[PDB]
Amino acid sequence: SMQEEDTFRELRIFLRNVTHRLAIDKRFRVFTKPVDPDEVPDYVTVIKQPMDLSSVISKIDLHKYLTVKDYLRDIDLICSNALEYNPDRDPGDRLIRHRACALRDTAYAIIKEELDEDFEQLCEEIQESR
Numbered sequence: 001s002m003q004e005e006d007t008f009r010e011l012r013i014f015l016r017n018v019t020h021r022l023a024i025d026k027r028f029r030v031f032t033k034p035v036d037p038d039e040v041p042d043y044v045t046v047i048k049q050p051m052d053l054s055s056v057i058s059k060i061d062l063h064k065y066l067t068v069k070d071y072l073r074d075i076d077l078i079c080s081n082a083l084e085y086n087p088d089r090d091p092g093d094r095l096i097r098h099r100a101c102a103l104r105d106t107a108y109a110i111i112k113e114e115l116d117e118d119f120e121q122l123c124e125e126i127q128e129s130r
């Protein structure tokens, strides 16, 4: 229905605003664009589902997220990809793991404070009815 289309529209506006707030934070610059295969030719070979905040915006706009839970699965991938690709004890890998964890925690904290649980439940029920 048009009411349901309005609900998904509101979801996309909410997700674009959360994603923009993560993207303008200086800590998260490394996550704003895909890993360039130049610098890192093995990346695409180790990480099977690369994810970054530009990809998340593209997905919002393609109507790929019908719930906040689906969007958080992709935020979780940004975190878990960095834990998997940069697991060593040296400071460069610890810094990216801490930043990727902080991204994830920040997205979850904004959603805890600003997503109404009844709005999420509505999205879940429309998605399940399709």
Ligand SMILES: CC(=O)N[C@H](C(=O)NCCCBr)C(C)C
Pocket (backbone or CB within 6 Å): 030, 031, 035, 040, 043, 081, 082, 085, 086, 092, 093, 096
């Ligand atoms: C997203 C990611 O894991 N990036 C790794 C990383 O530590 N970069 C940090 C920053 C500088 Br441009 C890289 C080894 C592929």
Ligand SMILES: [Cl-]
Pocket (backbone or CB within 6 Å): none
């Ligand atoms: Cl830095």
